[PDB]
Write an enzyme that holds these catalytic residues in place. Structure first.
Site, mmCIF file in Angstrom:
data_model
loop_
_atom_site.group_PDB
_atom_site.id
_atom_site.type_symbol
_atom_site.label_atom_id
_atom_site.label_comp_id
_atom_site.label_asym_id
_atom_site.label_seq_id
_atom_site.Cartn_x
_atom_site.Cartn_y
_atom_site.Cartn_z
ATOM 1 N N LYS A 1 0.851 -1.113 -0.033
ATOM 2 C CA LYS A 1 -0.111 0.011 -0.135
ATOM 3 C C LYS A 1 0.973 1.457 -0.075
ATOM 4 C CE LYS A 1 -2.727 -1.775 3.605
ATOM 5 N NZ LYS A 1 -3.331 -1.200 4.976
ATOM 6 N N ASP B 1 9.707 10.713 0.633
ATOM 7 C CA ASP B 1 10.455 10.626 -0.590
ATOM 8 C C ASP B 1 11.870 11.285 -0.465
ATOM 9 O OD1 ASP B 1 10.825 12.263 -3.709
ATOM 10 O OD2 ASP B 1 10.137 10.041 -3.629
ATOM 11 N N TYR C 1 19.942 14.603 -3.135
ATOM 12 C CA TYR C 1 19.386 15.820 -2.322
ATOM 13 C C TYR C 1 20.291 16.161 -0.988
ATOM 14 C CZ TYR C 1 15.167 14.617 -4.684
ATOM 15 O OH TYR C 1 14.116 14.195 -5.760
ATOM 16 N N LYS D 1 16.424 7.230 -4.479
ATOM 17 C CA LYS D 1 16.426 7.316 -5.879
ATOM 18 C C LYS D 1 18.230 6.811 -6.177
ATOM 19 C CE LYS D 1 13.036 10.582 -6.412
ATOM 20 N NZ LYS D 1 13.491 11.542 -5.187
ATOM 21 N N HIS E 1 16.741 7.689 -11.153
ATOM 22 C CA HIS E 1 16.410 8.935 -11.213
ATOM 23 C C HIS E 1 16.440 9.567 -12.384
ATOM 24 C CE1 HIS E 1 16.717 12.543 -7.727
ATOM 25 N NE2 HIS E 1 16.301 12.749 -8.921
ATOM 26 N N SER F 1 6.859 18.146 -7.936
ATOM 27 C CA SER F 1 6.573 19.301 -8.029
ATOM 28 C C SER F 1 5.194 19.473 -8.284
ATOM 29 C CB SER F 1 7.212 19.636 -9.134
ATOM 30 O OG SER F 1 8.799 19.548 -9.131
ATOM 31 N N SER G 1 7.504 26.476 -6.334
ATOM 32 C CA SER G 1 7.538 27.722 -6.357
ATOM 33 C C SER G 1 9.041 28.626 -5.998
ATOM 34 C CB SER G 1 6.358 28.529 -5.823
ATOM 35 O OG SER G 1 6.163 28.216 -4.587
ATOM 36 N N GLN H 1 -1.569 20.637 6.584
ATOM 37 C CA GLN H 1 -2.604 20.968 5.447
ATOM 38 C C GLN H 1 -2.449 20.247 4.285
ATOM 39 O OE1 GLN H 1 -1.977 25.392 5.245
ATOM 40 N NE2 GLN H 1 -1.655 25.097 2.962
ATOM 41 N N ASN H 2 -1.051 19.889 3.909
ATOM 42 C CA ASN H 2 -0.911 18.847 2.683
ATOM 43 C C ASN H 2 -1.309 17.483 2.708
ATOM 44 O OD1 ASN H 2 2.228 20.707 1.812
ATOM 45 N ND2 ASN H 2 0.136 21.337 1.529
HETATM 46 N N1 NAP Z 1 12.046 12.707 -9.388
HETATM 47 C C1 NAP Z 1 12.819 13.758 -9.526
HETATM 48 O O1 NAP Z 1 13.829 14.081 -10.310
HETATM 49 C C2 NAP Z 1 12.406 14.747 -8.701
HETATM 50 C C3 NAP Z 1 12.585 16.334 -9.296
HETATM 51 C C4 NAP Z 1 11.688 17.272 -8.349
HETATM 52 C C5 NAP Z 1 11.159 17.021 -7.171
HETATM 53 N N2 NAP Z 1 11.143 15.729 -6.868
HETATM 54 C C6 NAP Z 1 10.571 15.648 -5.375
HETATM 55 O O2 NAP Z 1 9.337 15.835 -5.220
HETATM 56 C C7 NAP Z 1 9.264 16.671 -4.294
HETATM 57 C C8 NAP Z 1 8.337 18.005 -4.213
HETATM 58 O O3 NAP Z 1 8.414 18.874 -5.218
HETATM 59 P P1 NAP Z 1 9.372 20.360 -5.270
HETATM 60 O O4 NAP Z 1 10.073 20.204 -3.772
HETATM 61 O O5 NAP Z 1 9.976 20.581 -6.399
HETATM 62 O O6 NAP Z 1 8.288 21.494 -5.112
HETATM 63 P P2 NAP Z 1 6.800 21.268 -4.481
HETATM 64 O O7 NAP Z 1 6.521 20.275 -3.682
HETATM 65 O O8 NAP Z 1 5.881 21.395 -5.656
HETATM 66 O O9 NAP Z 1 6.935 22.836 -3.942
HETATM 67 C C9 NAP Z 1 7.429 22.776 -2.624
HETATM 68 C C10 NAP Z 1 7.214 24.484 -2.402
HETATM 69 O O10 NAP Z 1 6.035 25.016 -2.078
HETATM 70 C C11 NAP Z 1 6.103 25.421 -0.729
HETATM 71 N N3 NAP Z 1 4.962 24.773 -0.110
HETATM 72 C C12 NAP Z 1 4.675 23.838 0.643
HETATM 73 N N4 NAP Z 1 3.348 23.535 1.042
HETATM 74 C C13 NAP Z 1 2.925 24.872 0.847
HETATM 75 C C14 NAP Z 1 1.804 25.204 1.010
HETATM 76 N N5 NAP Z 1 0.730 24.306 1.551
HETATM 77 N N6 NAP Z 1 1.301 26.638 0.575
HETATM 78 C C15 NAP Z 1 2.052 27.263 -0.270
HETATM 79 N N7 NAP Z 1 3.387 26.923 -0.442
HETATM 80 C C16 NAP Z 1 3.718 25.598 0.051
HETATM 81 C C17 NAP Z 1 7.551 25.047 -0.055
HETATM 82 O O11 NAP Z 1 7.811 25.883 0.920
HETATM 83 P P3 NAP Z 1 8.277 25.569 2.232
HETATM 84 O O12 NAP Z 1 8.976 24.220 2.446
HETATM 85 O O13 NAP Z 1 9.399 26.590 2.931
HETATM 86 O O14 NAP Z 1 6.988 25.411 3.234
HETATM 87 C C18 NAP Z 1 8.473 25.091 -1.396
HETATM 88 O O15 NAP Z 1 8.946 26.432 -1.657
HETATM 89 C C19 NAP Z 1 10.507 17.086 -3.674
HETATM 90 O O16 NAP Z 1 11.214 17.615 -2.678
HETATM 91 C C20 NAP Z 1 11.348 15.907 -4.199
HETATM 92 O O17 NAP Z 1 11.102 14.993 -3.174
HETATM 93 C C21 NAP Z 1 11.898 14.686 -7.423
HETATM 94 O O1 C2U Z 2 15.574 16.028 -10.241
HETATM 95 C C1 C2U Z 2 16.101 16.350 -8.896
HETATM 96 O O2 C2U Z 2 15.119 16.387 -8.019
HETATM 97 C C2 C2U Z 2 17.353 16.980 -9.003
HETATM 98 C C3 C2U Z 2 17.752 17.315 -7.516
HETATM 99 C C4 C2U Z 2 19.291 17.720 -7.651
HETATM 100 CL CL1 C2U Z 2 19.581 18.407 -6.262
HETATM 101 C C5 C2U Z 2 19.778 17.956 -8.853
HETATM 102 C C6 C2U Z 2 19.435 17.359 -9.915
HETATM 103 CL CL2 C2U Z 2 19.956 17.474 -11.862
HETATM 104 C C7 C2U Z 2 18.192 16.999 -10.085
HETATM 105 O O3 C2U Z 2 17.577 16.613 -11.512
#
Ligand code: NAP
Ligand code: C2U
Length: 322
Positions: A13, A45, A50, A80, A113, A211, A216, A272-273
């Site tokens: 799950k 995650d 990171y 990853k 990744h 994301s 943002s 809240q998330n």
């Molecule tokens: N597979 C990949 O290559 C890869 C690539 C990108 C991301 N990821 C993963 O996906 C995760 C999430 O994506 P992300 O970190 O890029 O961005 P995201 O979760 O879409 O956005 C995070 C941003 O939004 C803010 N935030 C969080 N909750 C909020 C809310 N309820 N209201 C308003 N703003 C809010 C955070 O600020 P604060 O933290 O200051 O509260 C932060 O600046 C990453 O941490 C990572 O684990 C993986």
């Molecule tokens: O995809 C990511 O989350 C990522 C994070 C970091 Cl810290 C660096 C690279 Cl190239 C990435 O692609």
């Protein structure tokens, strides 16, 4: 168990909300893990790249396992494999390093990744000469077989894919003895991935939206591109439902059974998330949010402002239509 789950083909799950940890730094990440676990998160995650697994491991050791506040069997931990670690010989030492940093005996999900490899070694961003990236030509299918051997060793429960296109996924399935269980890719109302999500349901892969909030505060960014959280339609649904814009964005995804991993270090936002399972959009509201689709990708690897780092690579996933 604040959040609902989806069943992976393995029988695991997987909670529909996890905590993202990209850019949560050592000095703050420990507090975030701990707060998230204590208010009901059961899905984290992570990734080696990171650079925060050692401190995430510290928080997990305190809070998870025999004698602790959270049983290990009730936690879903994802990590990853980084691009420098694609050679079959390197896959296992990479994972065991992640296990050690995390202080875990196993991972629930281990993702590739990217489909393309970097030069082998201890530099995560290896370079030329001109300062472009140095690539290694290990094919993702070879990496995949080496990842299967980790499942056999009990080090990982499930395998999956990150930033793979539909054709790369099907290429992996043609050789897969252990089928991937999850695709993780960028997804939100501006990049809805409807085509790729349909492709995954055909093939038994669950989808995790990274994301999910438009990310943002990513490290550069165009002045002129829209901000997802400021979106008029999103802000008006927020007001209608007495919710935050982020809650609107996340509800849209879990309503179509897309797993989301919003990152926050803000305790009130963390809370809240995960509170996205007590309201429902009408078909017409869903439709409004489905109309926002614009093929706007926020997360593209860049380097050296003296550019798009990997856009020109033959194995770059983003050139096909999906
Ligand atoms: N597979 C990949 O290559 C890869 C690539 C990108 C991301 N990821 C993963 O996906 C995760 C999430 O994506 P992300 O970190 O890029 O961005 P995201 O979760 O879409 O956005 C995070 C941003 O939004 C803010 N935030 C969080 N909750 C909020 C809310 N309820 N209201 C308003 N703003 C809010 C955070 O600020 P604060 O933290 O200051 O509260 C932060 O600046 C990453 O941490 C990572 O684990 C993986
Ligand atoms: O995809 C990511 O989350 C990522 C994070 C970091 Cl810290 C660096 C690279 Cl190239 C990435 O692609």
């Amino acid at each position: 168990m604040a959040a609902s789950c989806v069943l992976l083909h393995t029988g695991q799950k997987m909670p529909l909300i996890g905590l993202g940890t990209w850019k949560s730094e050592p000095g703050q990440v420990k507090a975030a893990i701990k707060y998230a676990l204590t208010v009901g998160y059961r899905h984290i995650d992570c990734a080696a790249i990171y650079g925060n697994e050692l401190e995430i491991g510290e928080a997990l050791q305190e809070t998870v396992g025999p004698g602790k506040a959270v049983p290990r069997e009730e936690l879903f931990v994802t990590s990853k494999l980084w691009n420098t670690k694609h050679h079959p010989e390197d896959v296992e030492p990479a994972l065991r390093k992640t296990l050690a940093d995390l202080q875990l005996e196993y991972l629930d999900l281990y993702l590739m990744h990217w489909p393309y490899a970097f030069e082998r070694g201890d530099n995560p961003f290896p370079k030329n000469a001109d300062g472009t990236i140095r690539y290694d030509a290990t094919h993702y299918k070879d990496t995949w077989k080496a990842l299967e051997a980790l499942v056999a060793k009990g080090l990982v429960r499930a395998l999956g894919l990150s930033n793979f296109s539909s054709r790369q996924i099907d290429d992996v399935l043609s050789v897969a003895s252990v089928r991937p269980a999850v695709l993780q890719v960028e997804c939100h109302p501006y990049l809805a991935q409807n085509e790729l999500i349909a492709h995954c349901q055909a093939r038994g892969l669950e989808v995790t939206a990274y994301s999910p909030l438009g990310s943002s505060d990513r490290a550069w960014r165009d002045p002129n591109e829209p901000v997802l959280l400021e979106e008029p339609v999103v802000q008006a649904l927020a007001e209608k439902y007495n919710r935050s814009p982020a809650q609107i964005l996340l509800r849209w995804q879990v309503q179509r059974k897309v797993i989301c991993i919003p990152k926050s270090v803000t305790p009130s936002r963390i809370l809240q998330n995960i509170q996205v399972f007590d309201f429902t959009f009408s078909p017409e509201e869903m439709k409004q949010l489905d109309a926002l689709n614009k093929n706007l990708r926020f997360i593209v690897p860049m380097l050296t402002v003296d550019v798009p780092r990997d856009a020109g690579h033959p194995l770059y996933p983003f050139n096909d239509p999906y």
